[PDB]
């Protein structure tokens, strides 16, 4: 599985959660930004590594990173 | 025994086919059919 690490530069704009078509990201409460929420990735075994969350993020050098690690049947996206 | 007509090679294989290969698979298919349940 890949590793989706979310850094503290996140402003709680929740663009990455509604962009990811696999339901791995989700907004948890926080106290370090104006929106008082930060994205978090509990279901990292379902992430394929498509990096569609690293296309909709407003910070400089986007606060969410997807490190492409191991592969499996879910991370390679196989219907067979 | 030969053939003066056109395609003399053709009864050479059609006579053993209709003599052996057709009735053996016909009786095989029919005996499988009439004895099944």
């Amino acid at each position: 599985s890949h590793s989706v690490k979310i850094y503290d530069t996140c402003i709680g704009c929740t663009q990455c959660v509604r962009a990811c078509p696999l339901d791995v990201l989700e907004m948890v409460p926080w106290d370090g930004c104006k929106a008082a929420q930060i994205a978090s990735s509990p279901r990292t075994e379902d992430c394929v590594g498509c990096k569609r969350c690293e296309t909709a993020c407003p910070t400089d050098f986007l606060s969410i990173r997807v490190y492409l690690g191991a592969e499996t049947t879910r991370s390679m996206g196989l219907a067979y | 025994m030969d053939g003066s007509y056109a395609a003399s090679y053709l009864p050479w294989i059609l006579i053993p086919m209709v003599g052996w290969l057709f009735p053996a698979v016909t009786m095989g298919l029919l005996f499988i059919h009439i004895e099944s349940e």
Partner: protein, 141 residues
């Protein structure tokens, strides 16, 4: 949760559907409550008639199920926002996958936990020399 209640929608049958991975490793199943008998495009291929009431559809990947959930939540004027995506094993067990907390992940609720959250910037990441033979990753540690 453990039992899937629904009827199959009206569909003629396709080729991009459930392959041999479904009865061997895993498959997925989306259940939703419709309003009318409208037409939806399944990610397998072609169109299908969405049955009235609670209906169930078996898919092969989770991405097809979430793509159908996006199609149910955006491309209808009676916006269907009460769909549940389960994971079905060949052993018979059914795992509730999405929206398993109960509320959609786009909005925040109390009860979640910050998994996989770092307390630094990306420029504050360590260098791969100090951990050159620890076996870990430069992003993990």
């Amino acid at each position: 949760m453990t039992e899937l209640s629904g009827q199959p929608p009206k569909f003629g049958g396709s080729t991009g559907g459930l392959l041999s991975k479904a009865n061997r490793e895993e498959k997925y199943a989306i259940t939703w409550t419709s309003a009318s008998e409208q037409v939806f495009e399944m990610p397998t291929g072609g169109a299908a008639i969405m049955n009235e009431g609670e209906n169930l559809l078996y898919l092969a990947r989770k991405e097809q199920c979430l793509a159908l959930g996006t199609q149910l939540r955006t491309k209808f004027k009676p916006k269907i926002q009460d769909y549940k995506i389960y994971r079905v094993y060949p052993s018979g067990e059914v795992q509730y996958l999405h929206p398993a907390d109960g509320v959609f992940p786009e909005k925040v609720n109390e009860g979640r936990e910050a998994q996989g959250t770092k307390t630094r910037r990306i420029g504050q990441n360590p260098e791969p020399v100090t951990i050159k033979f620890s076996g870990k990753a430069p992003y993990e540690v």
